[PDB]
Structure 1
Amino acid sequence: ARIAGINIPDHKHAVIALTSIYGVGKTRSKAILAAAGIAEDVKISELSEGQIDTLRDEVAKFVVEGDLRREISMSIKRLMDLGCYRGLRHRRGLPVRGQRTKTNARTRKGPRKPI
């Protein structure tokens, strides 16, 4: 069934099925089933409507999806706008050398590539 943000674990145990989530893993898979009181050896197709309900609400309170990916993008954007080499490394569109990369470097690059 569907729990968090876009996830459809089908035909598998309650444990391994939840392991397919970007946020929770094995450690979290066991603790959640123990808190909601659910058999870990039961398939997702054998779970009742009441069991899944208590599973969604609890697993709900967690961090996942886009909102998290934007936090990552921002983290890479902050050191990118500054004078940090690591940020320039993320781009790697910078000079790898020791001569100039800005111009006159076609002897290694080859034909001019589109901007």
Structure 2
Amino acid sequence: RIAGVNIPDNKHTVISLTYIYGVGRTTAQSICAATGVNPAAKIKDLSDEQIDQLRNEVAKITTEGDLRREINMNIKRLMDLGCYRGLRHRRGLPVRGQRTKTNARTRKGP
């Protein structure tokens, strides 16, 4: 609603744009370069004018409310085909080819 989500205050611009969930850190360094907003000032000190140009960039990359939708179909395409990358992805095993006998605990919990 503010830029797609709420944006914190009393912070620099590149840090503030990070919470938009679809722009990391290197991408938000291009947006202040392409628009011209100084990151060295806070978001409080800005004008209420050029935020549309920041909002123009949000309408060109992705939005987290639909980013998580479309990335699920990338998962969902892998599951319903029954390919090996979606075979373990149904179950909960690691995917990229890690070791399974021990230590793969961030995909199985405590």
TM-score range (shorter-chain normalised) is 0.5 to 0.7
Structure 1 runs (4+) deviating above 4 angstroms are none
Query: What TM-score do the two structures reach when normalised by structure 1?
Result: 0.66
Instruction: Indicate if the aligned counterparts of 1:76 and 1:87 stay in contact, CA closer than 8 A.
Output: yes
Instruction: Indicate if the aligned counterparts of 2:14 and 2:39 stay in contact, CA closer than 8 A.
Output: yes
1:14 is aligned to 13
Structure 1 counterpart of 2:69, which letter? R
Structure 1 counterpart of 2:22, which letter? G
The structure with more radius of gyration: 1
Q: CA RMSD in A?
A: 2.2
1:52 is aligned to 51
Query: What displacement does 1:92 show?
Result: 1.4
Distance in 1 between residues matched to 2:40 and 2:29, nearest whole Å: 11
Distance in 1 between residues matched to 2:67 and 2:52, nearest whole Å: 25
Aligned residue-pair number: 92
List aligned pairs for 1:73-92, cutoff 5 A: 73-92=72-91
Return 5+ residue gaps in structure 2 as ranges. 93-110
Query: What TM-score do the two structures reach when normalised by structure 2?
Result: 0.68
Secondary structure class of the residue paired with 1:30 = helix
1:65-109 Cα deviation digits (max 9, x unpaired): 23222222212222212232332212217xxxxxxxxxxxxxxxx
2:98 is aligned to none
Structure 1 counterpart of 2:12, which letter? H
2:65 is aligned to 66
Return 5+ residue gaps in structure 1 as ranges. 94-115
Percent same amino acid among aligned pairs? 66
Secondary structure class of the residue paired with 2:19 = coil
Distance in 2 between residues matched to 1:72 and 1:55, nearest whole Å: 24
Distance in 2 between residues matched to 1:29 and 1:8, nearest whole Å: 14
Instruction: Indicate if the aligned counterparts of 1:11 and 1:45 stay in contact, CA closer than 8 A.
Output: yes
Instruction: Indicate if the aligned counterparts of 1:12 and 1:44 stay in contact, CA closer than 8 A.
Output: yes
